[PDB]
Design a protein around this ligand. Structure first.
Ligand SMILES: [Zn+2]
Ligand SMILES: [Zn+2]
Lengths: 107, 108
């Protein structure tokens, strides 16, 4: 029984569409995804993808869902905002450093 | 005029519609993306998990996340995080090296 069928009460049949990606030892993975995206959407979105991309797709969904559970307002957009601010700060600092270095290089 | 959610769902946008303050008619693709990725029912319930003063930010985040998954159906906005993780590390390395070079100009 995969994590999905355990959660969903149903028997986990050969070819259960979640079993390849929701093992029972990771209950949190399916609970978060179901709460944020919904089991039906996930089946729909996985069917739209090449089979060889579905493992990475599930991993991304699980990451996004977990971030949504722990930060209901921003989810992982919060991380993106934090990282974008730090890029800006560092690029500003690098600007000053590069001009200082260029002045030294000119004698 | 019905909000973008009610126009998409082909239902009457009534006074008190939970979507109307956040899905204006001028931005139909915003709702279409959020509906595809999260679903109207999930957004309805999340919006009611939140106080009024956070709903606008929540929808903004959902919209960005859904648009990212339309553009990148595999990784979504996690691809952005991966890129930003690499870039921050790289810029920090470059800045540390520049500070080291500056000190050698003054001391070495
Ligand atoms: Zn199963
Ligand atoms: Zn409406």
């Amino acid at each position: 029984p995969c994590a999905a069928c355990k959660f969903l009460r149903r028997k986990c049949l050969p070819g259960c569409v979640f079993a390849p990606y929701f093992p029972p030892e990771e209950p949190q993975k399916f609970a978060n995804v179901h709460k944020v995206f919904g089991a039906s959407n996930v089946t729909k979105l996985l069917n739209e993808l090449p089979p060889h991309q579905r493992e990475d797709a599930v991993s991304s969904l699980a990451y996004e869902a977990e971030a949504r559970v722990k930060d209901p307002v921003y989810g992982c957009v919060g991380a993106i905002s934090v990282l974008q601010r730090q890029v800006h700060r560092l690029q500003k600092e690098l600007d000053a450093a590069h001009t200082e270095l260029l002045r030294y290089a000119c004698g």
